[PDB]
Input
Amino acid sequence: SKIDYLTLFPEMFDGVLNHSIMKRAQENNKLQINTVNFRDYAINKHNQVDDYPYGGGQGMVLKPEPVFNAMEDLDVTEQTRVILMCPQGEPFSHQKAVELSKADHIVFICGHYEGYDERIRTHLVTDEISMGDYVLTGGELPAMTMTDAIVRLIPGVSDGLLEFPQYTRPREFKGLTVPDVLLSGNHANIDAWRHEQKLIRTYNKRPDLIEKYPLTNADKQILERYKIGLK
Ligand SMILES: NCc1ccc(CNC(=O)c2csc3nc[nH]c(=O)c23)cc1
Output
């Protein structure tokens, strides 16, 4: 598996690529990563990478020329996945992280442009993906974030409830005391207490999850005595 980033700000990938999980995984001969710059493939390098839109338009538009040239020498194939970071792409998701982790070659087209030449989309891009309804400056951070979720899912690199509260040393800290049950060594009571907390927190902060949860008699009894202790 190999992952390529087509970007104008390749320096912006410095920390991410050289540090943490991707830095380790690259070294294990698990994936090859390349950071390629658009401007390098500009036909003229003076009116390059982008230009005015035919028929008028709000902003500048990424030109097809540099992009097809980049794909050409990146050895892109019909099995490759050419992902375009765009605001109106499909929101990224876990099922997509799996599908892409199962792919050999991935090419991210990262950009800030008000628009992308349609010929790029119709004949190169296999996938268009966003991070969500909000507005970002460009595609690099989304490309890196998607890479993170995909890479950890490459080999070799919920119960329907919110999680239970967790605590560690010290036991007492600014008057804030770890629940005693967690120090008692009674694993049945520790699990039961954790389960009660899961139920109560989900009740308070995600009641929709309680509705989708197969509540036992004990679970109902727990919620009632909680909503009665409240008064
Ligand atoms: N006015 C149109 C317009 C066009 C491009 C941009 C630059 N944005 C991106 O390249 C982007 C990539 S993935 C993603 N996910 C969520 N939001 C985003 O903005 C993005 C912003 C606004």
